Inverse folding.
């Protein structure tokens, strides 16, 4: 059946609409669930590496694996309890960590596929063709698109560069790596780090693993870092029907700063991330997590110090809340690198009706 | 707790710096355009010193002169300098014996071997030392240790493997290895004399040498008693462990923050780099310690003194320090290198990760990479140097020369190639 | 046969020939000699010619836009899957036809899209475009309360030329230096601009000084307008504030001279952001907000 | 090294079918290399490429359909088409391309082995295979099944042919732990030897008999080894001992 109720820490007064609670340590569940989904959920819940791009790919891979492992029952047809199973999986995912736009899209695609082939065909012939098709799709709309984006970026970069970067966006890492290796230009990379997830640190590590000249900074230290420095790059999660940048934590402030200090910002996005859902603020629907992330006192993730703070429930009237997904302003980013080479962010849903 | 004397082991590690240390004393040489003794003195002051004692033998007159010229000579100082003059060339045992013969040793005396500059507060350490002393009657000396850079790889001269206790903080075994440099002994040794008493055994290697010692009144007496101990780390600590005098305790202080002593050339360079960055918490040149200094802080870890002149259109990298009275031309690429006081740099010069000492002329169209130039030694037109090329005192490198990796140049006007006179050895000229 | 020669051929005439249309015509002429039936022998050669033209360019942008448009048109043409002859013939026809169209477009612009200046609205005009001038002259023809303010253009004294052109129409005019342009926004109602090209982002590729003007307009909340003939859509993205594929130097710091020789190397091409535009007047309907981008998307199908 | 045409003529004709392995696309069409008629690049247009997502399917490496529209038999300009394909003809074209590729692969290892020109090899191959039989890959397959096509023209190289055969397809290791407890044994062993060879048998130890089974096309070696095992079993059952087979 699962687990219900029992939530740690204070519920707070403001920003109460989305799930923030749940299974962290498993106790009593339905005896039919494939363990790979569970494992994935466990990973996602306590993940520090993923950022919008790879999650969907991982999900797809998991689905493929499931399909490979899938065996049709002797009594009922191929789609009878499969849908129920899928629903259960979705519920589990939501309980663990809320579904993204890409994930939703993937789900939709899966549904479409299910509708396409009606229950009449044998087992070993249908899924052979399905898995291949899905692979082909993956090759087409994801990796190739990414490659295209990279190539677009390649021509867009001039001579003598000094760049400030943020996020665990895989595409940006790929880009920077490409710059370092195959272009052989005068590239300087400055990294910004965030408290909820150590993405900046990871980026820095990756850079080191290549051999790049790296400056390392934070959200606070920005007034002195400019005083030569030109380009600013950010990693997007999804663009809505309005045209606003619905992305991760510390981006919007950086963008604002860039706007203030002359030189504009450039953001990268895929040609599948676009949504029909309409929202213009972070209050509507937000990725909210447990206040366990904001416990460690600087330096590293595993340190555990008995300093000053270490209580939430016992404290009378104390609200310690943090947000993961933000809504950045529309006019501030100028450059958007999508499947159609180059374009403005004000286009919003030009690819949505195109499908 | 108050009133503590200091004894500094100076002029001990000569000929270890193979090109230099022949005409001028070891410690008088500048770290970052300013003498190495000063930093040590500052550290001592921070710790809590009431009287200063220095051990001099090799070029002692110059040291004396420096002392006379120095700020502590004037009556405002809490600590006065009185030097120990001894016969030439002797080990630390002999020095200790000499000290004992004289007799100034009272209570908890401070013995520092070499020159050390670190950021960690010492009062707390002193308190700890006192408390531990108050535990048992037969307690000896304090050793300082700091956590290394995760994995050891740049440490070959002194990669000491410390087997340590968590409850008492006491050393179990000391051993030196040539393992990363020469694959002959990739080795570990443990003795069974203290196995069934400690129980909590932690085997570690990643700890850096500091060689700062807080010593009781027992130590000189011990030294007098056992004359076989010439050194203080290799034979002494081991002896103490193996029960030379039964029922005795030693300290090994653990600190998360940076603490490294000066030992070789690469290590020295690393220390300098650290100093340039914000590794040491209060130790910055812009505060001005020597009073004649006029250093000021600038963006992107760049130090500039007063009366520093730099010409237009010169692209600089990261971490650069320039001394007073400098004249630098156009079209220079400067990256991670320190320029000395009153140095005259020409035009179109590419520098990467190098080091330049006091009053040096760098010739037009030259490339310098990871190499050191000592005081009053000049570089001519078209000189191409590779990684780790040490240049001695007053060496005149004239027109057109090329030197390969790890080429050492003599300082005194013997055994090593390239001499102090006109042109470095590509065509035979010298004494 | 050459396209460059053809381009040269027009110098003193112009003033209605939309340079890009002329270029298109030249391209068509080049095409209709060496048999347009084969795609292997022809399209590649056309591309090569275009490349050559680009290489030879002194200070022109719209040529590329024209050529790519032509290419797109050609591509569109052979989707009917009928026969090679008739389609080829149609293509051939469509060169002179295209030229003919431009005049009609101009007429449409001058009759429909001239309603902005009516109740004695004082106009601030900068950046020479033929369309804007036509609109002005044909507004005079229609008879309406109107007044003109001229900002001094200095590439090679084009402002004077503009003034002279204005004169041969009968209308009081005054000259304003683009330094005191910040001082006078009070009596002047609206700002109008003629562009060299429209970017992928939405922004305007123009002349010696436009960005500053745009900024001023934004500050004053008096609307900024761009009037152009609808064929200046180039696949170009000015990502930063001071970057464009320019033939001239982008702010070159000249060495210490004595005889005063190297000085006049100031920015002769400037770019303004997408948000500054209030209305863009084109023959293919009154469209502005993100219309150019949409058009581009339609063209490239991406 | 890879060069020269596949068939007899350098340039194709009208209606005849080809295929491209696309390296880069989307500008005019694709000016990419062919693998049916010469390695010299030809051009497809972005007009007769879309039949019914268009920029995602092709891209890099994937096999894509071609038919020769217009030929300039003077200097070298070839027109290619994807939409013209005669319906299911696409599949046939693909098959042909595959065959061509296989043929090319076949005449690459031999070129590298004997250090002889590829064009000459192609010339020597493409006459009773690419003209009479249909395509050459199918002919090769037929030959491998039962030799009949190679017999038409005399081969200058036999080692090359052998190598090719090997590639298309071998000693298989077999260890029989002979632990006999029989009365007469040596004779039995001799008998076994006299039946199993009629392949390469070596002896290192007294109880261990090492044998390597020769295979014609890899899969045939399973049938022989089993037979040998059976023979061995037959051998010692009559006398009064045992042979253990791993």
């Amino acid at each position: 059946p699962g687990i219900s109720s029992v939530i740690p820490t204070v519920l707070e007064q403001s920003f109460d609409n989305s799930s923030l609670i749940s299974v962290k340590e498993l106790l009593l569940n339905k005896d039919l669930i494939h363990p790979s989904i569970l494992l994935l959920t466990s990973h996602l819940a306590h993940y520090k590496i993923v950022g919008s791009i790879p999650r969907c790919i991982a999900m797809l891979e998991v689905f493929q694996i499931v399909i490979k492992d899938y065996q049709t029952p002797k009594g009922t047809t191929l789609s009878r309890n499969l849908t129920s199973y899928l629903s259960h999986q979705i519920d589990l995912l939501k309980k663990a960590r809320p579904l993204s736009v890409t994930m939703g899209n993937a789900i939709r695609w899966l549904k479409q596929e299910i509708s396409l082939i009606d229950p009449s065909t044998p087992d070993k012939a249908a899924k052979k063709d399905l898995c291949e098709k899905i692979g082909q799709f993956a090759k087409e709309k994801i990796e190739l698109a990414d490659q295209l984006i990279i190539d677009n970026a390649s021509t867009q970069i001039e001579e003598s560069t000094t760049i400030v970067t943020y996020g665990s966006s895989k595409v940006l890492t790929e880009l920077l790596l490409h710059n370092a290796i195959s272009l052989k230009k005068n590239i300087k990379v400055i990294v910004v780090d965030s408290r909820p997830l150590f993405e900046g640190r990871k980026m820095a590590e990756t850079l080191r693993n290549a051999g790049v000249n790296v400056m390392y900074a934070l959200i606070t230290s920005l007034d002195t870092i400019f005083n030569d420095v030109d380009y600013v790059f950010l990693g997007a999660h999804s663009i809505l029907s309005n045209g606003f940048l619905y992305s991760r934590a510390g981006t919007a402030m950086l963008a604002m700063s860039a706007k203030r200090r002359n030189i504009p910002v450039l953001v990268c996005c895929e040609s599948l991330k676009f949504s029909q859902r309409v929202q213009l603020d972070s209050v509507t629907f937000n990725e909210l997590a447990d206040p366990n992330d904001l416990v460690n006192i600087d330096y590293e993730n595993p340190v555990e110090r008995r300093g000053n703070k270490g209580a939430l429930l016992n404290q009378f009237i104390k609200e310690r809340k943090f947000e993961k997904k933000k809504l950045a302003m529309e006019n501030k980013p100028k450059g958007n690198k999508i499947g159609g080479k180059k374009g403005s962010e004000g286009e919003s849903k030009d690819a949505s009706n195109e499908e | 707790e108050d009133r503590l004397q200091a004894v500094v082991l100076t002029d001990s590690y000569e000929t270890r710096f193979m090109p230099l240390t022949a005409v001028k004393p070891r410690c008088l040489l500048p770290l970052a355009n300013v003498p190495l003794i000063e930093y040590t003195l500052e550290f001592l002051a921070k710790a809590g010193v009431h009287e200063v004692f220095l051990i001099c033998s090799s070029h002692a007159n110059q040291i004396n002169d420096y002392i006379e010229n120095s700020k502590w000579n004037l009556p405002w100082s809490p600590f006065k300098i009185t030097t120990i003059m001894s016969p030439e060339a002797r080990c630390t045992g002999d020095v200790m014996r000499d000290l004992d013969n004289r007799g100034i040793i009272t209570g908890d005396f401070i013995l520092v071997s070499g020159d050390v500059l670190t950021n960690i507060d010492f009062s707390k350490m002193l308190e700890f030392h006192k408390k531990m002393h108050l535990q048992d009657k037969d307690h000896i000396s304090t050793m300082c240790l700091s956590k290394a850079s995760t994995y050891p790889k740049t440490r070959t001269i002194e990669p000491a493997a410390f087997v340590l206790d968590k409850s008492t903080s006491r050393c179990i075994y000391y051993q030196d290895l040539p393992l990363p440099s020469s694959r002959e002994k990739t080795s570990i040794q443990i003795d069974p004399e203290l196995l069934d008493n400690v129980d909590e055994f932690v085997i570690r290697n990643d700890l850096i040498d500091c060689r700062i010692d807080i010593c009781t009144s027992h130590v000189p007496l011990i030294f007098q008693e056992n004359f076989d101990y010439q050194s203080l780390r290799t034979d002494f600590v081991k002896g103490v462990i193996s029960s030379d005098i039964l029922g005795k305790h030693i300290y090994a202080y653990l600190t998360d923050e940076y603490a490294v002593r000066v030992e070789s050339w690469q290590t020295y360079d690393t220390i300098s780099q650290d100093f340039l960055g914000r590794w040491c918490y209060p130790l910055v040149l812009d505060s001005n310690i020597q009073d004649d200094q006029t250093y000021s802080y600038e963006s992107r870890h760049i130090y500039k003194e007063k009366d520093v002149v730099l010409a237009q259109s010169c692209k600089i990298g990261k971490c650069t320090a320039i001394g007073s009275g400098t004249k630098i031309g156009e079209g220079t690429k400067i990256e991670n290198s320190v320029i000395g006081r009153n140095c005259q740099i020409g035009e179109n010069i590419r520098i990467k990760n190098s080091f330049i000492w006091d009053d040096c002329i760098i010739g037009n169209n030259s490339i310098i990479d990871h190499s050191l130039i000592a005081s009053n030694a000049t570089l001519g037109s078209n000189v191409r140097l590779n990684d780790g090329c040490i240049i001695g005192f007053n060496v005149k490198i004239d027109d057109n020369m090329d030197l390969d990796r790890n080429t050492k140049i003599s300082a005194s006007p013997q055994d090593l190639d390239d001499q102090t006179l006109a042109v470095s050895i590509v065509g035979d000229k010298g004494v | 046969f050459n396209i460059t020669e053809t381009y040269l051929r027009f110098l003193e005439e112009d003033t209605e020939m939309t340079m890009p249309i002329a270029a298109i015509e030249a391209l068509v002429t080049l095409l209709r000699i060496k048999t347009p039936e084969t795609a292997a022998e022809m399209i590649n050669t056309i591309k090569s010619s275009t490349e050559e033209l680009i290489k030879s360019i002194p200070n022109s942008v719209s040529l590329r836009a024209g050529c790519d448009i032509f290419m797109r048109f050609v591509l569109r043409n052979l989707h009917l899957y009928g026969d090679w002859e008739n389609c080829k013939q149609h293509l051939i026809e469509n060169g002179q036809l295209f030229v003919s169209r431009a005049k009609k477009s101009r007429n449409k612009i001058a009759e429909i899209g001239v309603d902005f200046i009516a109740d004695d609205d004082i106009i601030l005009v900068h950046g020479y475009s033929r369309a804007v001038f036509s609109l002005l002259n044909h507004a005079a023809n229609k008879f309406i309360r109107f007044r003109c303010v001229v900002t001094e253009s200095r590439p090679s004294k084009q402002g004077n030329q503009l003034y002279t052109l204005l004169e041969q129409k009968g209308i009081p005019v005054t000259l304003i230096v683009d330094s005191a342009v910040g001082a006078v926004i009070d009596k002047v109602d609206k700002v109008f601009v003629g562009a060299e090209g429209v970017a992928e982002s939405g922004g305007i590729i123009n002349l010696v000084g436009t960005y500053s003007v745009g900024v001023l307009a934004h500050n004053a909340r008096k609307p900024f307008y761009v009037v152009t003939e609808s064929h200046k859509f180039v696949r170009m993205f000015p990502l930063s504030s001071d970057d464009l594929p320019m033939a001239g130097p982008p702010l070159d710091f000249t060495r210490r001279t004595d005889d005063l020789e190297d000085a006049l190397r100031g920015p002769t091409i400037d770019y303004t952001a997408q948000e500054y535009i209030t209305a863009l007047i084109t023959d293919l309907g009154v469209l502005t907000p993100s219309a150019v981008s949409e058009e581009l998307i339609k063209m490239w199908y991406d | 090294t890879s060069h020269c045409r596949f068939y007899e003529n350098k340039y194709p004709e009208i209606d005849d079918i080809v295929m491209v392995n696309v390296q880069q696309i989307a500008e005019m069409g694709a000016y990419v290399k062919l693998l049916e008629y010469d390695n010299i690049e030809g051009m497809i247009l972005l007009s007769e490429l879309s039949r019914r997502s268009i920029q995602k399917l092709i891209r890099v490496g994937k096999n894509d359909v071609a038919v020769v529209l217009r030929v300039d038999k003077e200097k070298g300009y070839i027109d290619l088409s994807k939409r013209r394909v005669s319906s299911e003809d696409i599949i046939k074209c693909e098959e042909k391309y595959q065959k061509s590729k296989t043929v090319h692969s076949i005449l690459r290892y031999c070129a590298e082995k004997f250090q002889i020109p590829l064009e000459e090899l192609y010339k020597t191959i493409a006459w009773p295979l690419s003209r009479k039989f249909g395509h050459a890959y199918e002919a090769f397959k037929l030959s491998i099944i039962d030799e009949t096509v190679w017999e038409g023209i005399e081969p200058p190289s036999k080692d090359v042919l052998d190598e090719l055969k090997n590639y298309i397809s071998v000693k298989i290791r077999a260890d029989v732990e002979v632990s006999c407890f029989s009365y007469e044994g040596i004779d039995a062993i001799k008998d076994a030897l006299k039946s199993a060879e009629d392949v390469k048998v070596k002896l290192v130890a007294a109880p261990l008999y090492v044998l390597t089974t020769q295979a014609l096309d890899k899969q045939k070696g399973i049938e022989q080894l089993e037979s040998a095992i059976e023979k061995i079993t037959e051998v010692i059952t009559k006398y009064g001992g045992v042979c253990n087979i791993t």
Chain A touches chain C through 20 residues (CB under 8 Å). Chain A has two domains: 11-148, 149-355. The beta strands of chain A are 161-166, 187-193, 214-218, 232-235, 238-239, 245-247, 265-268, 326-328, 333-337. The first helix of chain A runs from residue 35 to 45.
